[PDB]
């Protein structure tokens, strides 16, 4: 009973047992919940998911950038086993406990910037984003929030409002929280089709956004600008150099809280501890979740002390938040990243994947763009000889990969992005094999 | 190493070690997070919380109605230990797993009503409430939601909007989600000061609410009425007999989705599986969290199939939701309730507590009202010979109980309610002792 780090197809995909389990799902779970690949998981670790039929699939999704340090990481297993025996919940607002404080300290340490910082914990990315806005409004005593045109921030009313794409995230769920405005992001590949300078010069892309913010809202009415350092669900869009620094600067000059949403990019994923570290961005607040606790429901807001302390006592909280078992897992996750060279591992994975995809792109112009950092890499698929999105090809490729025992996700505003989010504990051999399969499907 | 089911004071409260840990909390955690009793927990089970100084305190809060079946319940410990080894997270929307489906099935079974039902899982009460609204709007294609004047529903933008009390829940955090309207609830004790018939006749209290809903909103503009079967944070307010049934009926006659928020009342807490069971209320949707998984972050929306299936595919979800470890805990929690007679235990606790508090009230008219069901009981404190709230006395009593090693919570719109939320696994002796201490503090 130890999990073999090799792909294995005993059945077609999905298999007979998964198909049986699926009858139960259809009869019990709301039809609002969509499933990408309906194989039922019995076990996972390293770079492998094992299903109910005995198949072993190559994980190139890590549950959407969550099991970065690998499913059921051994330090996490240990930390959880010990904590679950001591206590499962006290509610930190009732009687506190050291595990919550320890996590706050570690986030204060590892996040960008070097001043006084404070943290608060919740259970989901959407909750943390919600609280970053509460914090910013309490501090500034201003109303509006600016989000970007490829942004994804969550499924609650306000975070739906912050999100750009109507289907499936927003359609039919409003009316939405007021005072949300939308600005254009740095999207080099498609900016390039119109203005070559904007695509390469990030400061100029920031000016484009700032001119609109100033005209349509004004700093005097603005609490916060919120941005993903790399847009996730919107299509793994890495902004031009200079873009994030220029937003930061403008926010400082204008008493607007600058918020980095690092829910997807955070915790070693991009080849640094946080995506903001690549250009030395120091946001006023940074939002984290997903990879923070190796799959346990936990999220955080971390930021400048003066800002984070603005809400009255008892103004922030929630019953479950900073659950002590989830905290034990968070501590073991941070420990794992530092002691096992995960940031460097992310950088190895970049070199391996970029090298394959760039060689593929030279051979096949259906790859409009190859972009990303660390273990967060994507290709955008287009019709040969143009820049027109090819969603059809994107879906066919993913469906073929699934059928070949490869868990690969799509994303993108136009439905034409293949994304790669392997756990860092994937072997180079499994990672290459996953890439081989993608190349074979595209070749014929 | 087994936890002694007896109160013990080795130090004053809080003790020197807790006070040391508190310096760390103040330096790391946002000042927005308030703490009721700053003792740092190292262990808990049965009816006892053990702190960092070796003190053993009587738990009369269960983390705000969360550890109903006891901290670190043995079936939960077992279920969690096994699951954490298999996998920690796949994201149900990526690749599903049986644990999530199993939980959906169990909630479909144990919730009120007998038709076709479906469930969806999230991580917090606030998230589940948010999703009940999304579901209702998708189904009805109407905008407005009605909540009540003692309501508490969560700390996100929309759930803040649904919540009645500005301090500390809402102040400075808006603007809020639009189309939330407020109606008057059945509050027998204080309704009685004005109209004796309204306080006893629930159907008449429903008419009062329905007349306002009709005048200020209209059914043709209304997606949902949402209500707590017993108002929690608002002061443990049990409505008059007939109130909930009459709302249900009106909602059916008018194509408005009726939503029971059972986040606090759910899972054996009130001497039935759900608070709605006492009058046979069958809501269209019921929202659950808190006690569902013995402290693990998990929440649910369960309801009529046709309603729950209204959102398009991928319209509902979230990354962490229905975490497999939290699900293992939920299954063990339901198993624990049924196999160990917890519902009956809740009823024993009612008889014990009501008997003490009613005898206390006959002797001491500072107890304006004694109310509640099962292990959800409260007294409302007032100035002797009137019905004027006495918040001061309420705080003094709780502070004195804390100093005597009793974890007891306050609540209420007017800050004058002592509430009792012991874990069901408290012994009668510890429960009586907790009541003895309260009686002694009030006597002199
Ligand atoms: Cl094979
Ligand atoms: Cl370019
Ligand atoms: Cl609260
Ligand atoms: Cl490199
Ligand atoms: Cl003692
Ligand atoms: Cl009465
Ligand atoms: Cl999502
Ligand atoms: Cl009884
Ligand atoms: Na179905
Ligand atoms: Na402080």
Q: How many residues can be counted in chain A?
A: 444
Q: How many whole angstroms separate alpha carbon A54 and alpha carbon A43?
A: 10
Q: Do B127 and A130 touch (CB under 8 A)?
A: no
> H-type helices in B155-277, by residue range?
157-162, 188-191, 196-200, 202-216, 243-253
Q: How many residues can be counted in chain B?
A: 444
| Ligand with smallest separation from the Cα of A405 | 1
**Per residue in A108-136, is it b (16+ CB within 10 Å) or e — as a string?**
bebbbbeeebbbbbbbbbbbbbbbbbbbb
Strand-by-strand arrangement of the B367-373 sheet: B367-373, B376-381, B417-420, B409-411
Which among A312, A327, A326, A265 is positioned nearest to A98, based on CA atoms? Answer: A327
A33, A80, A122 ranked by CB distance to B317: nearest: A33
Give the minimum alpha-carbon distance from A344 to chain B in angstroms, rounded to a whole number.
Answer: 24
Strand-by-strand arrangement of the A409-411 sheet: A367-373, A376-381, A417-420, A409-411
Q: Do B174 and A137 touch (CB under 8 A)?
A: yes
Do residues A271 and A279 make contact, with C-beta atoms less than 8 angstroms apart? no
Beta strand pairing status for B41-45 and A180-183?
A: unpaired
Q: Which residues contact residue A100 at a Cβ distance below 8 angstroms, ignoring those fewer than 6 apart? A: A92, A121, A322, A324, A327, B29
- The residue to which tokens 């909280």 are assigned: A317
* CA–centroid distance for A24 within its chain: 30
The tokens for B24 are 């760390």
A21, A25, A101 ranked by CB distance to B24: nearest: A101
Distances (CA, A) of B130 to A127, A155, B162, B316, B327: 11, 9, 10, 11, 20
Q: Which residues contact residue B399 at a Cβ distance below 8 angstroms, ignoring those fewer than 6 apart? A: none
Q: CATH 3.40.640.10 region(s) of chain B?
A: 73-340
The torsion defined by the Cα of B23, B28, B34 and B36, in degrees rounded to 10, comes to -40
Contacts with A168 from chain B: Cβ below 8 Å: 312-315
Q: How many whole angstroms separate alpha carbon B12 and alpha carbon A332?
A: 34
Q: Do B89 and A71 touch (CB under 8 A)?
A: yes
Q: Which residues contact residue B241 at a Cβ distance below 8 angstroms, ignoring those fewer than 6 apart? A: B202, B279
Q: How many whole angstroms separate alpha carbon B2 and alpha carbon A436?
A: 55
The tokens for B133 are 């609204």
Do residues B273 and B343 make contact, with C-beta atoms less than 8 angstroms apart? yes
Contacts with B94 from chain A: Cβ below 8 Å: 35-37, 61, 63-64, 407, 409
The tokens for A241 are 């150099």
Give the minimum alpha-carbon distance from A185 to chain B in angstroms, rounded to a whole number.
Answer: 24
Do residues A330 and A298 make contact, with C-beta atoms less than 8 angstroms apart? yes
* CA–centroid distance for A166 within its chain: 19
B34, B36, B295 ranked by CB distance to A323: nearest: B295
Contacts with A135 from chain B: Cβ below 8 Å: 30, 32
Element (H, E) at B306: helix B305-308
Q: Is B442 helix (H, G, I), strand (E, B) or coil?
A: helix
Element (H, E) at B392: helix B391-403
Contacts with A118 from chain B: Cβ below 8 Å: 28-31
Taking phi first (over 0 means left), then psi (-120 to 50 degrees means alpha), and beta for anything else, what does residue A260 get? Answer: beta
The tokens for A296 are 């346990």
Q: Which residues contact residue B416 at a Cβ distance below 8 angstroms, ignoring those fewer than 6 apart? A: B380, B381, B382, B389, B390, B391, B393, B394
Instruction: State which approach was used to obtain the coordinates.
Output: X-ray
Q: CATH 3.90.1150.10 region(s) of chain A?
A: 1-72+341-444
Looking at residue B276, what DSSP letter applies?
G
- The residue to which tokens 């961005």 are assigned: A281
Contacts with B310 from chain A: Cβ below 8 Å: 32
Which among B176, B132, B49, B48 is positioned nearest to B300, based on CA atoms? Answer: B132
State in Å: Cα A317 to ligand 3 middle: 6
* CA–centroid distance for A373 within its chain: 13
Q: Phi/psi at B352 (nearest 5 deg)? A: -55, -55
Q: How many whole angstroms separate alpha carbon A297 and alpha carbon A292?
A: 9
Helix axes A342-363, A428-443, angle to 10 degrees: 20
Q: Which residue of A has its CA nearest to B303?
A: A30
State in Å: Cα A309 to ligand 10 middle: 7
- The residue to which tokens 């700093």 are assigned: A219
Do residues B269 and B242 make contact, with C-beta atoms less than 8 angstroms apart? no
Residue A281's Cβ-side half-sphere holds a number of Cα atoms within 13 Å equal to 31
- The residue to which tokens 């969806």 are assigned: B120
Q: Is B323 helix (H, G, I), strand (E, B) or coil?
A: coil
Q: How many whole angstroms separate alpha carbon A49 and alpha carbon A51?
A: 7
| Ligand with smallest separation from the Cα of B58 | 5
Looking at residue B237, what DSSP letter applies?
B
Q: Do A319 and B125 touch (CB under 8 A)?
A: yes
State in Å: Cα A262 to ligand 10 middle: 24
Q: Which residues contact residue B351 at a Cβ distance below 8 angstroms, ignoring those fewer than 6 apart? A: none
- Give resolution, Å, one decimal: 2.5
Q: How many whole angstroms separate alpha carbon A49 and alpha carbon A45?
A: 7
> H-type helices in B45-201, by residue range?
62-65, 74-86, 98-110, 125-140, 157-162, 188-191, 196-200
Torsion sign (Cα): A306, A312, A317, A323: positive
Q: Do B41 and A87 touch (CB under 8 A)?
A: yes
Q: How many whole angstroms separate alpha carbon A298 and alpha carbon A280?
A: 26
Q: How many whole angstroms separate alpha carbon A326 and alpha carbon A114?
A: 26
Q: How many whole angstroms separate alpha carbon B56 and alpha carbon B48?
A: 6
Strand-by-strand arrangement of the A41-45 sheet: A41-45, A48-51, A56-59, A406-407
* CA–centroid distance for A273 within its chain: 13
Q: Is B321 helix (H, G, I), strand (E, B) or coil?
A: coil
State in Å: Cα A20 to ligand 7 middle: 25
- Per-chain residues with Cβ under 5 A from ion ligand 1: A 8-9
Element (H, E) at B329: helix B324-339
Q: How many whole angstroms separate alpha carbon B385 and alpha carbon B268?
A: 36
Looking at residue B380, what DSSP letter applies?
E
Contacts with A22 from chain B: Cβ below 8 Å: 96
* CA–centroid distance for A286 within its chain: 13
* HEC secondary structure over chain A: CCCCCCCECCCCCCCHHHHHHHHHHHHHECCCCCCCCCCCEEEEECCEEEECCCCEEEECCHHHHCCCCCCCCHHHHHHHHHHHHHCCCCCCCCCCCHHHHHHHHHHHHHCCCCCCEEEEEECCHHHHHHHHHHHHHHHHCCCEEEEECCCCCCCCHHHHHHCCCCCCCCCCCCCCCCCEEEECCCCHHHHCCCCHHHHHCHHHHHHHHHHHHHHHCCHHHEEEEEECCCECCCCCECCCCCHHHHHHHHHHHCCCEEEEECCCCCCCCCCCCCHHHHHCCCCCEEEECHHHHCCCCCEEEEEEHHHHCCCCCCCCCCCCCCCHHHHHHHHHHHHHHHHCCHHHHHHHHHHHHHHHHHHHHHHCCCEEEEEEECCEEEEEEECCCCCCECHHHHHHHHHHHHHCCEECEEECCCCCEEEECCCCCCCHHHHHHHHHHHHHHHHC
> In chain A, what is the greatest distance between 2 CA atoms, to the nearest angstrom?
63
Q: Do B137 and A319 touch (CB under 8 A)?
A: no
Q: How many whole angstroms separate alpha carbon A336 and alpha carbon A423?
A: 13
Taking phi first (over 0 means left), then psi (-120 to 50 degrees means alpha), and beta for anything else, what does residue B141 get? Answer: left
A25, A126, A311 ranked by CB distance to B96: nearest: A25
- The residue to which tokens 């200020």 are assigned: B216
Do residues B274 and B265 make contact, with C-beta atoms less than 8 angstroms apart? yes
Contacts with A95 from chain B: Cβ below 8 Å: 35-41, 49, 51, 407
Helix axes B391-403, B428-443, angle to 10 degrees: 130
Q: Is B56 helix (H, G, I), strand (E, B) or coil?
A: strand
The CATH number, out of the four listed (1.10.1040.10, 3.30.1490.20, 3.40.640.10, 1.20.120.80), of the domain defined by the range A73-340 = 3.40.640.10
The tokens for A97 are 């406990």
Q: How many whole angstroms separate alpha carbon B201 and alpha carbon B197?
A: 6
Q: How many whole angstroms separate alpha carbon B217 and alpha carbon B178?
A: 13
Do residues B259 and B283 make contact, with C-beta atoms less than 8 angstroms apart? yes
Q: Do A296 and B409 touch (CB under 8 A)?
A: no
Burial class (CB in 10 A: 0-12, 13-18, 19+), A82: exposed
The tokens for B166 are 């500005």
B25, B177, B311 ranked by CB distance to A96: nearest: B25
Give the minimum alpha-carbon distance from A77 to chain B in angstroms, rounded to a whole number.
Answer: 6
Q: Phi/psi at B43 (nearest 5 deg)? A: -175, 150
Q: Which residues contact residue A372 at a Cβ distance below 8 angstroms, ignoring those fewer than 6 apart? A: A230, A236, A238, A350, A353, A354, A378, A420
- The residue to which tokens 């910037």 are assigned: A113
Contacts with A125 from chain B: Cβ below 8 Å: 319
CATH no., domain A1-72+341-444: 3.90.1150.10
Breaks in chain A after (C-N > 2.5 angstroms): none
Q: Is B97 helix (H, G, I), strand (E, B) or coil?
A: coil
- The residue to which tokens 């299509």 are assigned: A235
Q: Which residues contact residue A195 at a Cβ distance below 8 angstroms, ignoring those fewer than 6 apart? A: none
Residue A105's Cβ-side half-sphere holds a number of Cα atoms within 13 Å equal to 13
Do residues A277 and A286 make contact, with C-beta atoms less than 8 angstroms apart? no
Which among A91, A35, A290, A101 is positioned nearest to B125, based on CA atoms? Answer: A91
Q: B398 forms bridges with which residues in the sheet?
A: none
- The residue to which tokens 């009686």 are assigned: B439
Give the minimum alpha-carbon distance from B203 to chain A in angstroms, rounded to a whole number.
Answer: 32
């Amino acid at each position: 009973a130890s999990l073999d780090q090799s792909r294995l197809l005993v059945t077609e995909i999905p298999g007979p047992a998964s198909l049986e389990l699926n009858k139960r799902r259809a009869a019990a779970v709301s039809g609002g919940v969509g499933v990408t690949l309906p194989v039922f998981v019995v076990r996972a670790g390293g770079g492998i998911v094992e299903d109910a039929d005995g198949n072993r699939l190559i994980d190139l999704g890590s549950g959407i950038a969550v099991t970065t340090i690998g499913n059921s990481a051994p330090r996490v297993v240990d930390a959880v086993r010990d904590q679950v025996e001591q206590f499962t919940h006290t509610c930190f607002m009732v009687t506190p406990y050291e595990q919550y404080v320890a996590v706050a300290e570690q986030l204060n340490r590892i996040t960008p910037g070097s001043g006084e910082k404070r943290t608060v914990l919740f259970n989901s990315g959407a909750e943390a984003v919600e609280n970053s806005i509460k914090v910013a409004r309490a501090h500034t005593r201003k109303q509006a929030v600016v989000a970007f045109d490829y942004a994804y921030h969550g499924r609650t009313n306000l975070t739906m409002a912050l999100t750009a794409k109507s289907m499936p995230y927003k359609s039919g769920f409003g009316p939405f929280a007021p005072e949300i405005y939308r600005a254009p992001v740095s999207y080099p590949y498609r900016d390039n089709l119109l203005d070559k300078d904007i695509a390469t010069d990030g400061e100029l892309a920031a000016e484009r956004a700032i001119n609109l913010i100033d005209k349509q809202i004004g700093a005097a009415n603005l609490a916060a600008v919120i941005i993903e350092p790399i847009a996730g669900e919107g299509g793994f869009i890495v902004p031009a150099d200079g873009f994030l620094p220029a937003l930061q600067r403008w926010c400082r000059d204008n008493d607007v809280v600058f918020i980095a949403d690092e829910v997807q990019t955070g915790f070693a994923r991009t080849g640094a501890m946080f995506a903001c570290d690549h250009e030395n961005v120091e946001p006023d607040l940074i939002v984290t979740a997903k990879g923070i606790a190796d799959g346990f429901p936990l999220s955080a807001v971390t930021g400048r002390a003066e800002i984070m302390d603005a809400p009255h006592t008892s103004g922030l909280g929630g019953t479950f938040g900073g659950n002590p078992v989830a905290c034990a897992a968070a501590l073991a996750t941070i420990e794992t990243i530092e002691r096992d060279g995960m940031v460097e591992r992310a950088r190895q994975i970049e070199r391996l994947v970029m090298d394959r995809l760039l060689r593929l792109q030279a051979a096949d112009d259906r790859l409009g763009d190859v972009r990303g950092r660390g273990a967060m890499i994507a290709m955008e698929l287009v019709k040969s000889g143009t820049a027109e999105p090819d969603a059809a090809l994107t879906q066919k490729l993913a469906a073929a990969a699934h059928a070949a025992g490869v868990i690969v996700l799509t994303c993108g505003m136009f439905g034409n992005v293949i994304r790669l989010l392997p756990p860092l504990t994937i072997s180079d051999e499994l990672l290459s094999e996953g890439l081989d399969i993608l190349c074979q499907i595209l070749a014929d």
